[PDB]
């Protein structure tokens, strides 16, 4: 396999569907990436990670370089070696986390400074930085590392935001470019800022272009804006992407945003909806999600949901998982851990067949009708 | 296969191994029984449960007879279907746990009743009603309700307690015959008491062959006599019990306690140490348990341990373990516990060929020397 190759095998209105070509392995598009925050997919093993369908996991660079260690992975044999997961594992810059999760945060030019969540140790990020921990986890989808723009957002601080990241973008691409083993290996995305602003969106759009990636995320939504507005956004911005590329909206998400991101043009998504959400009693049906813990599942022997052809809901009840989500017990988490990200791709898989045989419209109406009923 | 049928194929010294068939399986003796404390052995899926080895796992009906609930279990077709382990399962009669975790404790010659410790609801057992609940679960092995006697404790109270667990076993037996497709389906182990006291280890021992049981477990013991004045106990007190039926130590334990339990005619054993202690770090190895947390194993590439054929040692690290643990991590605590509940299994396996081959001795001897090096 090639280091990099998308392929777009078929479409329907702005819907894409394809494959990423890469040397770990190939991602069938529309994808969904199960969350691996610290070097683990929550409750499961990379197996059964695989064995729910999916093509490639995320990484959380900020955890990953807090703890065990970027260079202590590297030491071990890179991410890969470490968690025991073979196929292509994208990384995020470590960025967003620095923001929601990092206290003492220095904001500069050249990067960021912060104290570490856990134990309040001193760390720093850069593009360069960034780039370089991404090489050490032995990332293969590595993302450029930018600068946040929080919603709301005035104007004046969008552009901003989006000039820097655009100018970290560039430092970004020539970190990567300027080691050898990670440019002829991996491979580099770009992020699109500019908040909820066209004009912004399109300039981001254009020096992101000029500069060249393997493929194009859209940043900055998800944030509180709204499915309404995020869609609206998404309706402008992702024609503004260069076609041949995949399109990443980056932090979504529930069923209804996939899908309509999909009919927008998006090829791959992210989230720890079904892992986190999962272990806190949520599970997703068809039918819309139900949270299992509620007492009118005490006695219901029915699987989670009525058609999924997971593991989970071959063998166990309602009624089991529920007792075991309210007793605490680590099975339960499992168990609903892996009919989520089950449910995901089986998602992804009806998404990727209906536009295949240009009936996704009529795929997407459907399941709403279901979904919202 | 009949309701019950114990084999010994092989004898060294005091120690046995051999058989116990079942309608739902066979039992291959010496046997250790992993833990299922709510209806789920902590962090493994039944099917790994299996793959370790173990042909009969334990559940505590303290626990079960408060959440899930007795009652909902069977209404929902018992427990191997509710947490799906169709092999035998052996459960306590919730005694020591009532003791022992329990508040507002008031007891009598009729039973005791309880305040839980959950919810401060108001609970009752007796001999009948621990036989009931245990019938609802529809439990393979039975355990006769006994009265526990704490140590250290005084001639009289060992005497007056053994006599009322003695009357609380004929009642277990007259309860359990009663229930025709109990009877018939399942079997009941009776309970040696008289803490450590010759007079009255055979006192109860008498009592019990009198009213005769499918097993014999030896009570009273590894609640704080330390291990000398254990195995000094189970010197005069195994040859007690009728030869021809198996022998269970309760509440044990150690890998060493094991052993010296086996040298002394003991068949049967079962403890939270494997999974409780992993959950908390504690591996086990040929050379003795480790902390998986300590610092010294944060780069160390090589498995939990060298020979072990586990699942776990074939693929992680005691690195990747080290920092699943201490980052609190669901998938730590997965892999330490199969990997202590194999380990576990194939101590048992080391056991029983060396008992069929005449060298128990010597591997009781061998694997001190290592274990304690
Ligand atoms: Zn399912
Ligand atoms: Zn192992």
Known sequence: ?????????????????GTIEM?????????????????????????????????????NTYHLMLRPGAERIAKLGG??????????????????????????????????????????????????????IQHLLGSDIVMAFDECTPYP????????????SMRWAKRSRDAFDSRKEQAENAALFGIQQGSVFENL???????????GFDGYAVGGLAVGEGQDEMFRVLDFSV??????????????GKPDDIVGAVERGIDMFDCVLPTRSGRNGQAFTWDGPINIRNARFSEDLKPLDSECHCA??????????????????????????????????????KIRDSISE??????????????FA
């Open 1 to 17: 396999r090639p280091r990099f190759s998308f392929s777009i095998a078929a479409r329907e209105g702005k819907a894409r569907t």
């Open 23 to 59: 040397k770990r392995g190939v991602i069938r598009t529309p994808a969904f990436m199960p969350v691996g925050t610290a070097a683990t997919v929550k409750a499961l093993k990379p197996e059964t990670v695989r064995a729910t369908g999916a093509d490639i996991i995320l990484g």
């Open 79 to 132: 991410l890969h070696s470490f968690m025991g997961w073979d196929r292509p594992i994208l990384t995020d810059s470590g960025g967003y986390q620095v923001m929601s999760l990092s206290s003492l945060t220095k904001q500069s030019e050249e990067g960021v400074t912060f104290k570490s969540h856990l134990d309040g140790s001193r760390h720093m990020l850069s593009p360069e930085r960034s780039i370089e």
């Open 153 to 164: 957002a005035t104007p004046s601080r969008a552009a901003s935001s989006m000039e820097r």
């Open 201 to 211: 969106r399109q300039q981001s759009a254009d020096a992101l272009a000029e500069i």
């Open 239 to 252: 024609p503004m992407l260069p076609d041949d590329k995949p399109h990443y909206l980056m932090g979504t």
């Open 312 to 349: 989970v809901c071959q063998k166990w009840s309602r009624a089991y998982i529920h007792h075991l989500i309210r007793a605490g017990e680590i099975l339960g988490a499992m168990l609903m851990t892996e009919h989520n990200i089950a449910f995901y791709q089986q998602l992804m898989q």
């Open 358 to 371: 240009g009936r996704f419209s009529q795929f997407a109406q459907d399941f709403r009708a279901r979904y």
